[PDB]
């Protein structure tokens, strides 16, 4: 929503004040991420992970909030548009993370094999005739 040709100032597009809808913040399942993307490397901060967050992003977030959301005044208008320099850092081989990894693991085991060390859920015990754990 920060891209508009008619609101270009010094080569950067900016978002006007008349395009902000007040109901967008209470929309949990409209602006959401679906899949995302994995990388075949070790965890860490790198150049190919897209939503990788360093210690320079939280300082920028605290700075922009204390900078009044990057207002752009105009002639005969106190505040006209919102500067696009405050949302640049939320704008963007690699594999999919959502394909399941359990299919290449071991088979699930029956319950008595899982009960090899301490016994849980036996009918002939004290705890079967007590109130369970909710």
């Amino acid at each position: 929503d920060f891209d508009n040709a008619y609101f270009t100032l010094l080569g950067v597009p900016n978002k006007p004040l008349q395009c902000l809808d007040i109901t967008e913040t209470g929309q949990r399942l409209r602006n959401r991420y679906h899949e995302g993307k994995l990388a075949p490397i070790a965890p860490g901060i790198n150049r190919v992970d897209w939503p990788c967050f360093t210690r320079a992003i939280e300082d920028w977030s605290r700075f922009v909030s204390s900078a009044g959301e990057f207002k752009l005044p105009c002639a005969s208008k106190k505040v006209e548009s919102f500067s696009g320099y405050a949302v640049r850092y939320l704008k963007p081989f690699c594999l999919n993370q959502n394909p399941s990894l359990d299919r290449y693991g071991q088979k699930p085991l029956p319950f008595d094999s899982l009960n090899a060390f301490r016994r849980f859920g036996s009918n002939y015990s004290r705890v079967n005739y007590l109130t369970p754990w909710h």
Binding site: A5, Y6, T8, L9, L10, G11, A75
Partner: peptide
């Protein structure tokens, strides 16, 4: 063209512009 959208921003009867097409720009 991003040059067009910056020149045409301040075109009008009572609008002051400092940008110049293909040259030096004003110091103000």
């Amino acid at each position: 063209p991003r040059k067009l959208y910056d020149v045409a921003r301040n075109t009008g009867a009572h609008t002051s512009s400092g940008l110049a097409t293909s040259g030096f720009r004003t110091a103000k």
